[PDB]
Ligand binder design. Structure first.
Ligand SMILES: Cc1cc2nc3c(=O)[nH]c(=O)nc-3n(C[C@H](O)[C@H](O)[C@H](O)COP(=O)(O)OP(=O)(O)OC[C@H]3O[C@@H](n4cnc5c(N)ncnc54)[C@H](O)[C@@H]3O)c2cc1C
Ligand SMILES: NC(=O)C1=CN([C@@H]2O[C@H](COP(=O)(O)OP(=O)(O)OC[C@H]3O[C@@H](n4cnc5c(N)ncnc54)[C@H](O)[C@@H]3O)[C@@H](O)[C@H]2O)C=CC1
Ligand SMILES: O=c1[nH]c(=O)c2[nH]c(=O)[nH]c2[nH]1
Ligand code: FES
Ligand code: FES
Ligand SMILES: [Ca+2]
Lengths: 1286, 48, 49, 49
């Protein structure tokens, strides 16, 4: 047969021409129109595409349910299953309890991740209707959220387990009988024998094998045939490595490859057994068998713990990981260390091998012959006197690629501590899984003692040598990890020998060493959210200050909320694919499109030649729409392929051959300094007398700090649909952008038409964070050109890898500082030179440097101060706005030298910070007066509520009692100026209509990107008009309703639009006045109808400009900011001194948001911003080749905070009784200010490292270096000890 | 760049209208249009 | 818009009577700018209610 | 004059767009005693009445 048959949300799908290259995600969205399931990365990392699969399992004889990544599931693997998507469980007319709870608990902000998270939770409940808190958290190991900070999702879902922001009492109960039926046809079909299927696509043939005979016959006849089981490797090879396997065979149905057999020597799993089944089988065995038999099983389980998430483990096979033979496989070192038994078969042949060095003979290769397949692996029981450990250290604990991964085994001669067998196996130390074959034989018959410890360590350091240029990098850290892993194993074995009554032979473990051997333990979360109740007299219809949920939260949880790519395609719609430079700096010498033209559906390749008017674009007119003559970064857009489908556009884009002639490249900040390659002149703020200040200072400290950049990772990538109207150059664009005005202007300029022809529309974005303030236009202009040229609508949504490459991120910073201070810790002089890496266009870089300079004081009054900044012009993708906009970088530098002041003085850091803090009425270094200065209030409240002083006691105690784990604790304040640094951008507009039914249609210039702006504006309008929010609607943002709008940026959008909305509403109220006076108690609808029939206008514009702004750098006078935001965070961490990993133990935040417009949204923004800062300072790192090519292009390599990354105790309080009269209804902006507060984690880590260096350092440098981000690499390398010195 | 709004609504209502059938008073119309046409035809008396 | 071009809309619909033409002529005189700088694209309830 | 002016039906259809046809009375004044859609339901592409 050859028809593909499956079910989607209960409806039968019959696909008569299934293409093997078609994924479930593409089929759902494009063939079926079910756009609740999202594309977020296409590589298994984000979980946005999570759906549920149900099938009758013939082996277990029962209906089973599991989650999968739709982005990686071939539809050809799904014959006779039942798919459930977000649409299949409920909708806004009848929400599933999972959907209701995430929406009402404020667990959905931008909403792009919500369906995937809903589906992960839904699947858990279908398997376990009463899960534990631990099981809930484990459900989301493969789900990412960039907006929420995770807290509210887990807190809302905790209600399923075992004023206020929400009320669990109001949540409807679960009734499992109301879930969708398992399609009866599938139960009928489970009696029919499985038959071989053949699917033939455009390039690939897929054979679904029903028997072992069929599989072996096929591999004998065609050894080239590619086995696919879970597709979690092959899917990535095809999508990202441009590999094509024209013949595929799926053996997933074969009983022999799915069997679990218990034998006398161990448990044998068929090679196609999903890792989820291995987990559940081994878990059962560990619980029921004696400890001494399960050492290997527990080692496998420890690795699987940090192996992807539920979606990948549902389909990823044990054999798949083995045969892939990646050097960083987490299972292969464990299988090698335990000498696991592998059965291999072909037609006519059967053999059994023990996994050792011989099994992996080269990079990504095995002992298998081309015609052979792996049948099974026996995972062995452990013996008496046999102990096992497994280790993994990556960049992030959860869902990540190991830097070093290991399996370690020791067997003792009975009744002794003498070594019979020793096996130490490693991933990430060579081009394959290797055994330490030279080191281990030398230890045989030795006693387990200090001498064996040092002997092995000396051996490992010599045997597992890394060249400085080894793939994977981080060579010092990796070498240190191999030694540290063995040390942990050595101490663990000492403990296990003690428990076997051999403690008098091997000796006791020092009690201060015990914590080194503990397996990672989570500890149950504790959250407190505190805010202020509204006045008792306040109307119940007045929602300002009330925790109203995001207006779209229900639709976002149900996948009914429409993002750009969810808009249905026109019948005549075309797809565009950008073609980008693979060189940092080169001449384009020729472009060959010969192969592109051969791709079916190819329309055209657009270049600079095709631009009708102007190829000069960008904020400072220094960018090209399409490259001309030269390319100036890797990612530089050269042209755009147009084709009928996205698949054909991608294929054709690969057929565009470019020839380059390299030109001298400038990559790093130092490169630019050496070449005088900058954007404009030096920027400078200076006050007081520096020479006097430094002479008067008791102490002077100088240093440098590097701060890495940051990728936005908005869950929805850049996307534009451009619809040409065929008249008068008219065009309408639907765009994921924070900047409708620039999108419009840039498109019009390129086309050579007036602004009045071009309409830009934004309903909502799946995140922006600054990344869509300008850089969205590089996609929009290209798509607009395609639409103009063809006269057809054209669409482009960037793949994650394209988006990360092209669109830039936060500016990396280099700082050179010199600070003068008294022995009391009072700072008297400060000189800082800032350098930023701007990339290949100016964009927002100079304003970002201005803000950094505006915040170089952080919270501290400094009488003699000089800050300079220079923006480097380099051959890298242009860097841009990112939440904070230079502020976090400037403030981290301030806190960095401040930490060194306190250490040099020998004084408590909090005391040094407090005594240097501004007071009410002080002037900043830029001469703005600090009025309504609430920072001391935030500080005192945070000190008290966090119990900082009592916890300092406990941290010091912990550090004296533990040698290999250390705690750290820090409290950090912040001041953040609110307003665009460019004065005229501080304006906003609104337009309001009242229809004759009394309903109100409102729009304003701000765009919704998850920050709950529309919700806030509806709350504002409802208070202003004195009508319930139910009568007011906002549908979208568009340039033809409100023109000349500033970007939704600078945290200012609620302030600016709120005032505009307010004014528009006041105009309407003014007009209704005479009708209100005539009918004082008559309803709103009567006034409206009376006004209409009296021919009074029911439409009005509203407008606001922020008064009295305008700073001069020439004279250091004038106010850049309308007001300041203030906040304080105290954070505690615990570091693993042997691995560089750490736990975020507790964070307490007190934030001044004025009289919050909406405390639910505001606490959400505090939490979201904080966790992005947590990422910036501790986790997120971009890596480039020496030639300037970004290596880090997806969630596999770029590690944003995970569910498990957040502080275990997470407390947020909004300051009470602090109205801010100058902004809308006494509120304050909240978007960017809390982000820097995550530096409290950075400095807590620095505190913990200091303690570690005091413990094991040999006269270590006191003012040691810790650049940002403080990653496991930097943490571990800074913990100098006997292992780092070896 | 001076942050002046560049958007405006406009509105108009025709003043002083309102006729009553009961009193035969008030003006239904704002003004009147006037015109004159002169036409010449030739008919076929046998066919129409 | 900031390039000086004007986007106008009103409650009237174009059905062949040259209403948009007349409104552009009116706007051009009122604003004292050429008709070429003024455009009417459509009539919609979400611009004029 | 060039056929470039867009009237309602000239707007491109969405890929998922459906078509509607009104069903009208063949009688000036009558009770509707019954409606039978059995034959309508046999037409390829029929969605609903
Ligand atoms: C999000 C994500 C996270 C991941 N995390 C980890 C991790 O933490 N640790 C880790 O080690 N890996 C990780 N991986 C890799 C991957 O999930 C595993 O290697 C998985 O076990 C592959 O199994 P599969 O069935 O999906 O392989 P497939 O892609 O179907 O096949 C993989 C390879 O194995 C071959 N093969 C499969 N079965 C047989 C057989 N029986 N006989 C001979 N050859 C066979 C195929 O021909 C193919 O070459 C991750 C991957 C993703 C996408
Ligand atoms: N997608 C995800 O999130 C995750 C995927 N997996 C695995 O990660 C793999 C990534 O594939 P690739 O990028 O091709 O990496 P790869 O399979 O080429 O392995 C790269 C690593 O191998 C080691 N290595 C290679 N050559 C070396 C040498 N000469 N000397 C020393 N060490 C050397 C280094 O540790 C290097 O980091 C996937 O195939 C998958 O199996 C694992 C964890 C997470
Ligand atoms: O002063 C600012 N100007 C901006 O353009 C901007 N964008 C942003 O995310 N923050 C800021 N801050
Ligand atoms: S889109 Fe499938 S995991 Fe991100
Ligand atoms: S709400 Fe989770 S990514 Fe935006
Ligand atoms: Ca730049």
């Amino acid at each position: 047969a050859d028809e593909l048959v499956f079910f989607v949300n209960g409806k039968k799908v019959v696909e008569k021409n299934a293409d093997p290259e078609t994924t479930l995600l593409v089929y759902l969205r494009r063939k079926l129109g079910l756009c609740g399931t999202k594309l977020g990365c296409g590589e298994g990392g984000c979980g946005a595409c999570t759906v549920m699969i149900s099938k009758y399992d013939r082996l277990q004889n029962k209906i089973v349910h599991f989650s999968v990544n739709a982005c990686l599931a071939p539809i050809c693997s799904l014959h006779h299953v039942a798919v459930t998507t977000v649409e299949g469980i409920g909708n806004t007319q009848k929400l599933h309890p999972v959907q209701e709870r995430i929406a009402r608990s404020h667990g959905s902000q931008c909403g792009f991740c919500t369906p995937g998270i809903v589906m992960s939770m839904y699947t858990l409940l279908r398997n376990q209707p009463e899960p534990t808190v631990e099981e809930i958290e484990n459900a989301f190991q493969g789900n990412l959220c960039r907006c929420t900070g995770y807290r509210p999702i887990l807190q809302g879902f905790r209600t399923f387990a075992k004023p206020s922001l929400f009320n669990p009492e109001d949540f409807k109960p679960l009734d499992p009988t109301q879930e969708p039926i398992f399609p009866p046809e599938l139960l009928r079909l489970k009696d029919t024998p499985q038959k071989k299927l053949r699917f033939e696509g455009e390039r690939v043939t897929w054979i679904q094998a029903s028997t072992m005979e069929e599989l072996l016959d096929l591999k004998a006849q065609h050894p080239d045939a590619k086995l696919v089981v879970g597709n979690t490797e092959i899917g990535i090879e095809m999508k990202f490595k441009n590999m094509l396997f024209p013949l595929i065979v799926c053996p997933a149905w074969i009983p022999e490859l799915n069997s679990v057999v218990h034998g006398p020597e161990g448990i044998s799993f068929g090679a196609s057994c999903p890792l989820s089944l291995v987990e559940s089988v081994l878990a059962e065995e560990i619980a029921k068998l004696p400890e001494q038999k399960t050492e290997v099983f527990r080692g496998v389980m420890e690795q699987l713990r940090w192996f992807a998430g539920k979606q990948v483990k549902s389909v990823a096979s044990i054999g798949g990981n083995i045969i892939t033979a990646s050097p960083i496989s987490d299972l292969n070192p464990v299988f090698m260390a335990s000498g696991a038994k592998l059965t291999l078969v072909s037609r006519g042949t059967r053999r059994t091998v023990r996994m050792d060095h011989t099994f992996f003979p080269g990079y990504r290769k095995t002992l298998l012959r081309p015609e052979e397949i792996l049948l099974s692996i026996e995972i062995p029981y452990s013996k008496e006197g046999e102990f096992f450990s497994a280790f993994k250290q990556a960049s992030r604990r959860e869902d990540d690629i190991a830097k070093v991964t290991s399996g370690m085994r020791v067997l003792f001669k009975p009744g002794t501590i003498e070594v019979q067998e020793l096996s130490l196996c490693f991933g990430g130390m060579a081009d394959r899984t290797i055994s330490a074959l030279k080191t281990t034989p030398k230890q045989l018959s030795k006693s387990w003692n200090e001498e064996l410890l040092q002997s092995v360590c000396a051996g490992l350091a010599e045997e597992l040598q890394l060249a400085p240029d080894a793939p994977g990098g981080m060579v010092e850290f990796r070498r240190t990890l191999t030694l540290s892993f063995f040390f942990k194993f050595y101490l663990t074995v000492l403990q296990k020998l003690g428990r076997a009554d051999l403690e008098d032979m091997c000796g006791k473990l020092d009690p201060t060493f015990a914590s080194a051997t503990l397996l990672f333990q989570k500890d149950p979360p504790a959250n407190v959210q505190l805010f202020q109740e509204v006045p008792k007299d306040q109307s119940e219809e007045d929602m300002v200050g009330r925790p109203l949920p995001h207006l779209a939260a229900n639709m976002q949880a149900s996948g009914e909320a429409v993002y750009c790519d969810d808009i249905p395609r026109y019948e005549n719609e075309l797809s565009l694919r950008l073609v980008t430079s693979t060189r940092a700096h080169a001449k384009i010498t020729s472009i060959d499109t010969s192969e592109a033209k051969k791709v079916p559906g190819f329309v055209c390749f657009l270049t600079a030649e095709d631009v009708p008017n102007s190829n000069a674009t960008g904020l400072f007119n220094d960018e090209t729409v399409f490259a001309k003559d030269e390319v100036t970064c890797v990612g530089h857009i050269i042209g755009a392929v147009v084709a009928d489908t996205p698949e054909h556009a991608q294929r054709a884009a690969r057929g565009v051959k470019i020839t380059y002639e390299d030109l001298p490249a400038i990559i790093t900040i130092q490169d630019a300094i050496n070449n005088n390659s900058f954007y404009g002149s030096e920027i400078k703020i200076e006050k007081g007398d520096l020479k006097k200040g430094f002479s008067e200072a008791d102490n002077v400290v100088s240093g440098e700090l590097y701060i890495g950049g940051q990728e936005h990772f908005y869950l929805e990538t850049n996307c534009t649909i451009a619809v040409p109207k065929g008249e008068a150059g008219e065009m309408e664009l639907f765009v994921s952008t924070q900047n409708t005005m620039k999108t419009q202007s840039f498109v019009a300029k390129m086309l050579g038409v007036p602004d009045n022809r071009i309409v830009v529309r934004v309903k909502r974005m799946g995140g922006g964070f600054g990344g869509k303030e300008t850089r969205s236009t590089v996609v929009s202009t290209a798509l607009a050109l395609a639409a103009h040229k063809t006269g057809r609508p054209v669409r482009c949504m960037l793949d994650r890898d394209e988006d990360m490459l092209i669109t830039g991120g936060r500016h990396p910073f280099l700082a050179k500082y010199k600070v003068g201070f008294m022995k009391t810790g009072t700072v008297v002089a400060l000189e800082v030179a800032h350098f930023s890496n701007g990339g290949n266009t100016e964009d927002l870089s100079r304003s970002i440097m201005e803000r950094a300079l505006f915040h170089m004081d952080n919270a501290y009054k400094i009488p003699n101060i000089r800050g300079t900044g220079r923006i480097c012009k380099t051959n890298l993708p242009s860097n841009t706005a990112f939440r904070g906009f230079g502020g976090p970088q400037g403030m981290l530098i301030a806190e960095y030298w401040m930490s060194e002041v306190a250490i040099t003085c020998g004084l408590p850091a909090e005391e040094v910070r407090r005594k240097n803090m501004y007071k009410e009425g002080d002037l900043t270094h830029f001469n703005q007066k600090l009025e309504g200065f609430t920072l001391p209030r935030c500080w005192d409240e945070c000190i008290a509520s966090s119990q900082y002083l009592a916890r300092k006691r406990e941290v010091e105690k912990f550090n004296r009692e533990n040698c290999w784990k250390k705690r750290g604790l820090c409290i950090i304040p912040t001041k953040f100026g609110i307003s665009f640094t460019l004065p005229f951008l501080n304006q906003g507009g609104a337009l309001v209509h009242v229809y004759t039914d009394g309903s109100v249609l409102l729009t304003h210039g701000g765009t919704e990107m998850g920050q709950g702006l529309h919700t806030k504006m509806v709350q504002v309008a409802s208070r202003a008009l004195k009508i319930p929010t139910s009568k007011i609607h906002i549908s979208e943002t568009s340039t033809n309703t409100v023109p000349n709008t500033s970007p939704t940026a600078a945290s200012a959008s609620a302030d600016l639009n709120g005032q505009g909305v307010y004014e528009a509403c006041q105009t309407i109220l003014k007009r209704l006045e005479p009708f209100k006076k005539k009918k004082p108690t008559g309803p709103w609808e009567a006034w409206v109808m009376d006004a209409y029939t009296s021919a009074v206008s029911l439409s009005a514009t509203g407008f606001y400009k922020t008064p009295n702004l305008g700073y001069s750098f020439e004279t250091n006078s004038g106010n850049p900011f309308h007001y300041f935001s203030y906040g304080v965070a105290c954070s505690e961490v615990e570091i693993d001194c042997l691995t560089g990993d750490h736990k975020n133990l507790r964070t307490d935040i007190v934030m001044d948001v004025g009289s919050s417009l909406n405390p639910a949204i505001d606490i959400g923004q505090v939490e979201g911003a904080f966790v992005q800062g947590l990422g910036l300072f501790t986790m997120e790192e971009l890596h480039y080749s020496p030639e300037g090519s970004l290596h880090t292009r997806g969630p596999s390599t770029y590690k944003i905070p995970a569910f498990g990354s957040i502080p275990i105790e997470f407390r947020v309080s909004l300051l009470r009784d602090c109205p801010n009269k100058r902004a809308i209804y006494a509120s304050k902006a909240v978007g960017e200010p809390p982000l820097f507060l995550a530096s409290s984690i950075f400095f807590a880590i620095k505190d913990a490292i200091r303690a570690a260096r005091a413990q094991h350092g040999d006269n270590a440098k006191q003012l040691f270096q810790l650049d940002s981000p403080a990653t496991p690499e930097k943490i571990r390398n800074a913990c100098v000890d006997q292992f780092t010195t070896l």
